[PDB]
Nucleic acid binder design. Structure first.
Lengths: 100, 238, 92, 94
RNA sequence: GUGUAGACAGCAGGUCGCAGUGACCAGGGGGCUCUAACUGUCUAAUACCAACAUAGGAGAUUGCAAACCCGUAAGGGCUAG
RNA sequence: AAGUCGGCUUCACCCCGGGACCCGUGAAAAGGACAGCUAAAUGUCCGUACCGAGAACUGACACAGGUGCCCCUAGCUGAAA
RNA sequence: GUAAUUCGAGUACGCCGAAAGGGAAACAGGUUAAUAUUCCUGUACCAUUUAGCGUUUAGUCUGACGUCUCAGGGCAAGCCG
């Protein structure tokens, strides 16, 4: 049986490495809609899950009592915070953490 | 023989005009009750009736019989429905219309006693008890006519559930198509003036018009009784 | 009565909720149980037979809460300490 | 708490799913019926607004499980309430 | 930078060509009228239309052993209404 | 001949759960489970090749049509079959 | 019923109606020129029946269900070291 002649993938591996680095992926390479390339429900799900996990860890370690935790959780569900970094920045700015 | 009309096809009973009887839940009628007897049952579920687009009540009676009943307004699961000459005149009970006070709302009214319930059965509207006499009792129908029935004729106390169903406009051909899928009625319907003369008395012509008066005699034979049948009058009320 | 009913909770021990009310009736610590117009009787006829008095409220469990200061609904409201009040006398 | 009710957005309501089809009159009728049906309805068994339509004419309480037959788009109709109040007046009289 | 991740978004600088969605793939647009509201259906094999249908509006018959209709009849459709 | 390991992703397949709609409320019956364990015997009949289509069907044809389709399809580019 | 039938609606009792609905149970490898979950090797499973050992919980559940949308977990295929 003659050897199978495959399809080599090295010149796709190099491009994949560059794309991981963030190159070869500009506007002149994008061809699907923004939304086909990044679904909005997926974006929201990851954002809200990150915020919720952050609030859960805060209330677990004791930096956040239940009264302000409820309001912060509803704020996050309402989209007041861009990300965990934004949430932490708001917490440190308005001194919501029960520092000791 | 200019072709038979849609009415003659329906009378023939072809599949295009037959009801999808397999889609229906039950032949809704009052439970059979011997002379001077009663039976009590409990409502176990409220289901949708595809043959009526109205709720129906599933009822388990004392005698081990499970039966579908025309549901009245406010009938709830777990309610005890009584059927008898001595039953409380209350919503959902099956009582003779001679024991219903004047001005009360009834539905599912038997044409004759023990008939099973004939009148006032669609979703929402009712009949009113007007007068009582020794052998006759009068009810105002949803039509507006007065019907004299035997006082022993049974009826469920209340109105039929589902009032206001026709209040929402169809809004869409397919909306009504989905309802027509469950009924024998042909949907959609071609106007007679759009047909050829072989298909209807009104068909044909260089331009659309019946060509003859649309009020037809009551004596006209089948295949000709089309348009306004034996109309007392026509037009919008003056 | 409009103020006696409020003062019974303002200056008195009560436990709201059917579970805690049934527990109080079972263990006797409740002077009585106040039940709304919508509370069943399948379990409640036993506490009726028991020496724990059963008061009937004039309104539903939804509106029993606001008159006793609770934002929620209350069906069984067994009282422990009448306090600065004679709600037991009002019941019976 | 609700949607972004823009300077012009308060007309279509739930009939915004129909676009420019079917006419303002029927769009208004359908929207009003949807609003009335989606309004909260108090349960006659527990007295709290948890009655939702489960089907054409079937209404169920999410709290106590009380299920009953009512109007097609409204749990309680004026004719049914009139009948109930007539019988209540009779019962009070006797 | 976001995200647990897959990935996605964004930035700074350098640089080549006539041309960087480089091939492939991939709306031309606007103004004024007639007509039908619209999606839909149609002369399989010359007519995909303004015709048919449609929701909406109106009228008529009939209380059910009904109106309407099929059968010579027995008996049926509408009607598990 | 090696035949040992890790990681990522995962549709269009499997399990599970939630929500919305009604305007078609979306079948029935056999069978199965709820009391069975052990050991012997029995389990008959029919189909089964091959094509399933730009040559195995159908259209008189080795016919550019039509005929069930797949709950069939690998790498790169690309939203993507 | 019909002049009558091989004709005719309905009712009663039966009986059929799906190789894509429901459904008791088998897999991998090898073997031929052509068959292979069918033959061979290995390892299983199901049904009744017989004999022994024991027995109802009985009438319930399952079979058993629409359209759209979405979460979680897994996985055939795919990809990387």
């Amino acid at each position: 049986a003659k050897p199978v002649k495959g399809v080599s993938r090295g010149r796709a591996r190099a491009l994949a490495a560059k794309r991981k680095y963030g190159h070869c992926k500009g506007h002149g390479s994008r061809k699907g809609k923004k939304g086909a390339r990044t679904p909005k429900k997926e974006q929201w799900i990851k954002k809200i899950r990150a915020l919720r996990r952050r609030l859960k860890e805060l209330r677990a370690d004791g930096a956040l009592d239940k009264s302000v935790y409820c309001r912060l959780y509803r704020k996050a569900k309402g989209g007041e915070y861009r990300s965990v970094s934004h949430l932490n920045s708001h917490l440190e700015s308005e001194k919501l953490l029960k520092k000791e | 023989m200019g072709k038979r009309l849609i009415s003659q096809n329906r009378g023939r009973g072809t599949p295009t005009y037959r009801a999808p009887s397999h889609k229906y839940k039950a032949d809704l009628r009052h439970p059979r009750v011997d002379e001077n007897s009663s039976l009590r049952g409990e409502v176990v579920g409220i289901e949708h009736d595809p043959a009526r687009s109205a709720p129906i009540a599933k009822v388990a009676f004392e005698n081990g019989e499970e039966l579908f009943l025309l549901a009245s307004e406010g009938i709830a699961v777990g309610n005890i429905i009584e059927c008898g000459d001595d039953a409380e005149v209350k919503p959902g009970n099956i009582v003779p219309i001679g024991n219903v006070p004047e001005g009360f709302f009834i539905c599912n009214v038997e044409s004759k006693p023990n008939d099973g319930g004939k009148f006032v059965r669609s979703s929402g509207v009712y009949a009113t008890v007007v007068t009582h006499e020794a052998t006759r009792t009068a009810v105002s129908m949803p039509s507006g006519n007065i019907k004299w029935l035997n006082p022993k004729c049974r009826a469920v106390v209340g109105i039929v559930a589902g009032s206001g169903r026709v209040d929402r406009p169809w809004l869409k051909a397919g909306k009504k198509y989905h309802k027509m899928k469950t009924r024998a009625a042909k949907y959609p319907r071609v106007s007679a003036v759009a047909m050829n003369p072989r298909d209807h008395p009104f068909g044909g012509g260089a331009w659309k018009h019946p060509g003859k008066p649309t009020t037809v005699s009551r004596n006209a034979p089948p295949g000709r009784k089309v348009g306004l049948i034996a109309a007392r009058r026509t037009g919008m009320k003056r | 009565v409009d103020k006696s009913l409020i003062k019974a909770v303002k200056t008195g021990k009560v436990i709201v909720g059917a579970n805690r009310t049934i527990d109080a009736a079972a263990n006797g610590s409740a002077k009585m149980v106040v039940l709304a117009s919508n509370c069943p009787e399948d379990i409640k006829k036993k506490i009726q037979a028991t020496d724990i008095p059963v008061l009937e409220y004039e309104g539903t469990s939804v509106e029993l809460g606001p008159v006793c200061g609770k934002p929620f609904t209350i069906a069984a409201m067994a009282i422990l300490d009448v306090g600065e009040s004679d709600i037991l006398a009002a019941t019976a | 708490m609700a949607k972004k009710f823009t300077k012009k957005g308060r007309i279509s309501r739930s009939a915004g799913r129909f676009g420019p089809r079917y006419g303002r009159k029927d769009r208004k009728l359908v929207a009003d019926l949807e609003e009335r049906m989606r309004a909260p309805h108090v349960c006659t068994k527990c007295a709290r607004p948890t009655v939702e339509r489960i089907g054409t004419g079937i209404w169920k309480c999410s709290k106590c499980g009380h299920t009953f037959a009512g109007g097609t788009y409204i749990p309680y109709t004026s004719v049914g309430q009139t009948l109930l109040r007539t019988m209540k007046n009779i019962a009070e009289a006797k």
